[PDB]
Design a protein around this ligand. Structure first.
Ligand SMILES: N=C1NC(=O)[C@]2(O[C@H](CO)[C@@H](O)[C@H](O)[C@H]2O)S1
Ligand SMILES: N=C1NC(=O)[C@]2(O[C@H](CO)[C@@H](O)[C@H](O)[C@H]2O)S1
Ligand SMILES: *Cc1c(COP(=O)(O)O)cnc(C)c1O
Ligand SMILES: *Cc1c(COP(=O)(O)O)cnc(C)c1O
Lengths: 807, 807
């Protein structure tokens, strides 16, 4: 149908139909009379998977022959979403499969909806790892993603009576056709025990053993025949009254059972620590095995890079030291040099509650030898600090890996900086914040370590896959090369006055909105005006992200309409979605507030179809692929200094929405790329937030001086949005008035004014679309191909390549 | 190579090689450079599995079109063993696959050894169900085996310091290529809750739900293109703080986690009761669904037969009543008629400790509605008894389903008899014992219900598969038809004086013994004389089976040699193997005694290679396939009246061993078929045991009057076989002298004398072999094809067929 989806060659289509029928018969053991839509999905998945296999085997043997430096991306989260369409896109099989399935009397898009998301992440950090794997494969890097194969991923969210309920995400229930179990590469992981000091050195003994069984998933590059591996570990009990002993195997296997559902919040639970060590211990043995199968560990950093995704895999540092010192018998100083040159650390947030600080008593019991190694690292590190800054005793305590207090804790971020040759933030403003505030001491000691690597998103999933209509009209003008060279979108600036292109851009958006409006009615029986401005905020629910600020604007619009009902206003559909961590009460109250506002606004006859408020249930990767292409306005409204980067922001920019946002995270760079005239910027800058903190934030001041704000708070308190439970939102009001860390009231006036300017521009379709074209055209910097190329050249010391392997 | 293994056609071999390479590449994602022997096994298994699929689909659609009466064999155990070779044998693919793999540079027998046993049974009862599935498919019956897919089967036995250690049988670790998950047929099973009585009847409410997910395994008939299904249920939690809630899903899923390892012993544990209801509830819903997809339940017994394998699935009776009365709204009397005509019950033992008697308080809590239905059944049943035998109040209490006492219990055997139209024992003597003793009251009320169905074994697995050499020399004389018509072996009687046949029979045995003697040295580094008489007792370790009587003989032989070292004796290798239930102390002591005797006997220089005692570790189906063909003497020495049938006995008879045995179980019929002159019969008959019980068994009498026996007991007590632990076997001696339920001493003299006659005959190879030929020739009755044909005609009301479906 459309060119960017590839060729539907007669032979290809014939062969796909044949192999589809083969799998339906031999693999699924079905015939067309009893086959369910799910059977058809699986037959297609197996058919597409067959085309990966040759390339996968050839890629891995190519790496063995050439022996390039290997990149190991360690993460507790990989938010992959669905795999079928992505694989077709990267293998240029989409049109052929569409044709093949059409000839068999099937609708391929219907089959695609059957696939479960691989929801092995919480949000942005997990999704970044997924985009990164795609870009590493597309750039021909010998890269491996290493993580945990959670039996249960991020919970499915149901909304009951306006409240979030959590349901287990049993994503493996029907099987996963993409993974290949590799039980032959099973490795032991040790826990507990004690340290014995001998003549030959330290020995870690009397441990409990859990087995780590790997499952490999292929990661195809974009039309380059490279297929890399994501290896995820699953916990298995070793095979050594009777019934209870067998049942108790569950205890060991619980390590890989479930993803911790906390976004930007540290929970110091033992099971989480076990997960972190489990992935690190299994992965490092695998790395070392692969390295030896190429004694001389001097060359280890030349053949191995380990990227630590946040501090979650920080135990890699002392584990690598443990193996090199206790098992390989290297001297400490040599082992340390190898470790530092091998490891690099990426920080993803400065929120204090997100920082991992593990109680010493936990490490003492679970990982006694690692604790010893951490103390040794700390002593040697602090000796360097003392030598560089003689007499500065407070710096010593500020920089220590060990935090003193009620309970002693290890600061894992400090461990990561000490043990890595490179430390990066994920957007320019964030990386500057790291050097100026939380890691200032470390920057002063080792400034060469500190870098920036601004985040990105893969344009395969986030344009070609989710928005083929837009990909096509772009390709019609500038060709297909931009899909793996997103900077080429700049060429679209010469079409900003092109009447045909303006018309096409606007038509594609309208089509996307109609499709999404239909999806809502079918799957959720809710009716929306497709001619309204689609105002979308989708991301995890958190105070710092300020869904509450959005809520205040929505209530402002509602109150203004009620005050002057017969005055024209630009119709809006305000869509908010995202999951709250199960134990985060305020986030759950925010979800309830949004639905409560919807209940009032959506049933007020005077409002009509001029304002609608919808809570998008179960926001996840597959839903992002639907809603983002349909959005007109992207809400990126975190308090300045809190969103390290954001990546949702980049997705909306690429898909033809305009952005209303603070100068926070990557928004700063997005505005810089597009021009501030083409961005709806409002609110405090970081410096303004600092000034307010110095004199003290008093929310009452804003309440006292802004009558429209006062009205809203009075409505909330009095039970306007909760008639039968008048005090339901008192916690929200109390927080806003007395304990608001994120200064919601301080940005309210500028936000509302800025939103009026959004409405003004939307009334002029042509100028709206021209500004959109200016955004899409300057979105190139935010390709994860650019991000990964920078990691490769500036941290890993390897050169990317766009050359293809033989098919 | 040999004809009974089928044709190796050039096209077949070419196609098998092609599909093998296809699976290695696409299914296993390997190439020949990195492929492990296990990968090669899986490639072959998938290749052979492909040939089942068409036949499997066609068989099931054939049953749908013809709508024959369906047979449902309900069992908690299916001891399947390995599947690869069996499938090849039944599809006539063995030689073709051997050729194909040979041309690829692989040894097929080596690949076969990689497959794990499906050890979903304890021993004889579980293996009977497996043989029965094979025969039902071979006889073209529309039959389904229904059970539980245990994650862990019968434990792997290791011997450490002469003691049994148990290891978890993680049989699914590398995957099971034979099964197909059918998540679309998942069914809810209910537990706990309470009964509510309404105007519309009883309602079972507030239950906890566990999901039952079926996995289907194909069961191929012998070269008839029939492929039936064994459906095994796996327990799954439904999808509805957070972390602990997810982890607690394990509790529901524990139902299908592990096989209870008790052989002939009832353990009244709640988890076991849950397993029993789980299989029954899921299976009956599946049966009813299939029945409705052909309201009028009058025809239910014409289209459905349910065979209860022991009392383990006895809850089928009240569950069927529950569904018919509570859900389908049939009146009680009609529901009962349907239930009785649908259900039939097979009793497998009379040992009192094996009988299921469930505490009422357990049923009350777990299955409150079933308890109510059981009481109602009991009241109506006892009203019939009272009417038939007026005034006989003791009969009423003897026949009650409810047993009074300290704890009230339900007698599940009584429930089964009341609710079934047919009750059978498993050998003629056993069925007579049922009518004369334990179910005498029931027989008097309903004599028409009571039947015999003498057990059998499948000659596919137990001759063609495990002993191709013997199958071939038989086929050379009388053709191949005997493999599905075992009565044709009678034709071998006309070769009993044929010098060539005598030579061939003896050569095949010698070859089997050499092969097994080699297996011992390779896998267990133990050296045995292959010219010795192979004296084998393999079966679960139990007092009633009297491994101890064997031990007494072995020590007698040893003492006689030590007394007259330079006298000639027929050399023997005495092999004993089998598992003990983990909580059965005496059985574990027996294993320790056997190894302790071996330690002394095997290292005594004066004995030399004249006597060896070996404990066969980890006795299981795959080991039975090796040792049984190598055996000369089969030990079947249970106390008369205790072994309901035995089936190991039949396996040895078919494979050219002579039998030393009591007149117990099927031994009686085996002796009857072969002639008592061709059997080594010894010991008390049932009537003799009864006489001894009447006057009281005094073991001291035998100790006092048999000096050879006295010496052995003195050796045991004094520490001759345990120097460093002199009193190790005091429990054994104490039991033998004072608390021996199985009268070991009473059969000692006759056993030893009988064993002397065995040795005498073995010294005359020609006459030994002629007697062997007379056994093999009369083994036809003990084909499970004969057994199943009798079930079909006399219980299920269906006609077997040897006609083949189209290929
Ligand atoms: N636990 C986190 N989750 C995120 O999304 C974080 O990482 C993302 C990827 O770098 C960033 O874009 C987000 O700003 C940050 O909150 S940190
Ligand atoms: N729990 C049991 N295990 C058996 O082997 C039993 O059933 C077999 C099959 O009918 C019989 O051959 C055995 O004699 C009997 O012990 S009963
Ligand atoms: C991109 C993405 C995120 C991150 O969005 P932000 O707005 O940057 O927080 C979260 N969840 C999903 C499902 C995503 O696709
Ligand atoms: C046949 C068989 C049995 C039953 O043997 P008996 O001697 O009848 O108790 C037990 N275990 C296995 C593995 C078998 O193959």
């Amino acid at each position: 149908q459309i060119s960017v989806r590839g060729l539907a060659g007669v032979e290809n289509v014939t062969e796909l139909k044949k192999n589809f029928n083969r799998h339906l018969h031999f693999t699924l053991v079905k015939d067309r009379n009893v086959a369910t839509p799910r059977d058809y999905y699986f037959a297609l998945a197996h058919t597409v998977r067959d085309h990966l296999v040759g390339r996968w085997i050839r890629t891995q043997q190519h790496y063995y022959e050439k022996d390039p430096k290997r990149i190991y991306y360690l993460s507790l989260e990989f938010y992959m979403g669905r795999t079928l369409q992505n694989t077709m896109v990267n293998l240029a099989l989409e049109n052929a499969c569409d044709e093949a399935t059409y000839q068999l009397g099937l609708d391929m898009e219907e089959l695609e909806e059957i696939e479960e998301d691989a929801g092995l992440g919480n949000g942005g950090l997990g999704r970044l790892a997924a985009c990164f794997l795609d870009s590493m494969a597309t750039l021909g890097l010998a890269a491996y993603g290493y993580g945990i194969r959670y039996e249960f991923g991020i919970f499915n969210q149901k909304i009951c009576g306006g409240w979030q309920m959590e349901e287990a995400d049993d994503w493996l229930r029907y099987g996963n056709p993409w993974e290949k179990a590799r039980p032959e590469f099973t490795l032991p992981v040790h826990f507990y025990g004690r340290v014995e000091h001998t003549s030959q050195g330290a020995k870690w003994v009397d441990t409990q053993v859990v087995l780590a069984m790997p499952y490999d998933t292929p990661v195809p590059g974009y039309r380059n025949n490279v297929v890399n591996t994501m290896r995820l570990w699953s916990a298995k009990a070793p095979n050594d009254g009777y019934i209870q002993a067998v049942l108790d195997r569950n205890l060991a296997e619980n390590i890989s059972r479930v993803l911790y559902p906390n976004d930007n919040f540290f929970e110091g639970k033992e099971l989480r620590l076990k997960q972190e060590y489990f992935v690190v211990a299994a992965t490092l043995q695998d790395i070392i095995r692969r390295f030896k199968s190429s004694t001389n560990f001097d060359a280890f950093p030349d053949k191995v890079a380990i990227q630590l995704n946040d501090t979650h895999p920080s135990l890699a540092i002392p584990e690598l030291m443990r193996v090199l010192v206790d098992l390989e018998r290297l001297d400490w100083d040599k082992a340390w040099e190898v470790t530092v040159k091998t490891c690099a650390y990426t920080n993803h947030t400065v929120l204090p509650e997100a920082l991992e600080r593990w109680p010493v008593h936990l490490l003492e019991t679970l990982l006694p030898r690692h604790l010893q190694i951490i103390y040794e690292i700390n002593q040697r590190f602090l000796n360097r600090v003392a030598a560089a800054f003689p007499g500065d005793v407070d710096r010593l305590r500020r920089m220590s890996l060990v935090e003193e207090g009620a309970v002693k804790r290890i600061n894992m971020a400090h461990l990561c900086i000490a043990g890595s040759h490179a430390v990066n933030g994920v957007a320019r403003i964030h990386s500057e914040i790291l050097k100026k505030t939380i890691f200032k001491d470390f920057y002063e000691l080792e400034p060469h370590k500190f870098q920036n690597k601004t985040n990105g998103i893969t344009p395969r999933r986030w344009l070609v896959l989710c928005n083929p209509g837009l990909a096509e009209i772009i390709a019609e003008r500038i060709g297909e090369e931009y899909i793996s060279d997103l900077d080429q979108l700049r060429k679209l600036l010469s079409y900003v006055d092109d009447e045909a292109f303006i018309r096409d851009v606007a038509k594609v958006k309208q089509e996307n909105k109609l499709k999404f409006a239909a999806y809502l009615e079918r799957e959720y029986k809710v009716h929306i005006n497709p001619n309204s401005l689609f105002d979308v905020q989708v991301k995890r629910i958190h105070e710092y992200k300020r869904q509450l600020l959005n809520c205040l604007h929505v209530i402002t619009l509602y109150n203004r309409i009620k005050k002057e009902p017969n005055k024209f206003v630009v119709p809006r559909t305000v869509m908010i979605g995202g999951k709250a961590a199960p134990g985060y009460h305020m986030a759950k109250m925010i979800i309830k507030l949004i639905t409560a506002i919807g209940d009032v606004v959506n049933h007020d006859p005077v409002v009509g179809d001029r304002l609608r408020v919808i809570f998008l249930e179960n926001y996840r990767v597959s839903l992002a692929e639907k809603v983002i292409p349909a959005a007109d306005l992207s809400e990126q409204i975190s308090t300045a200094g809190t969103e390290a980067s954001g990546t949702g922001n980049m997705k909306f920019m690429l898909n033809g929405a305009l952005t209303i946002g603070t100068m926070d995270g990557a928004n700063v760079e997005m505005a810089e790329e597009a021009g501030e005239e083409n961005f709806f910027i409002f609110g405090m800058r970081v410096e303004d937030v600092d000034r307010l903190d110095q004199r003290g934030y008093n929310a009452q001041e804003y309440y006292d001086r802004i009558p429209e704000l006062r009205q809203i708070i009075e409505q909330l308190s009095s039970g306007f949005f909760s008639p039968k439970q008048p005090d339901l939102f008192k916690d929200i009001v109390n927080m806003l008035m007395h304990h608001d860390r994120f200064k919601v009231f301080a940005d309210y006036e500028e936000y509302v004014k800025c939103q009026e300017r959004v409405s003004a521009l939307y009334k002029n379709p042509r100028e709206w679309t021209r500004m959109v074209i200016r955004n899409i055209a300057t979105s190139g910097k935010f390709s994860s191909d650019r991000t990964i190329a920078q990691y490769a050249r500036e941290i890993w010391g390897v050169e990317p390549s766009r050359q293809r392997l033989p098919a």
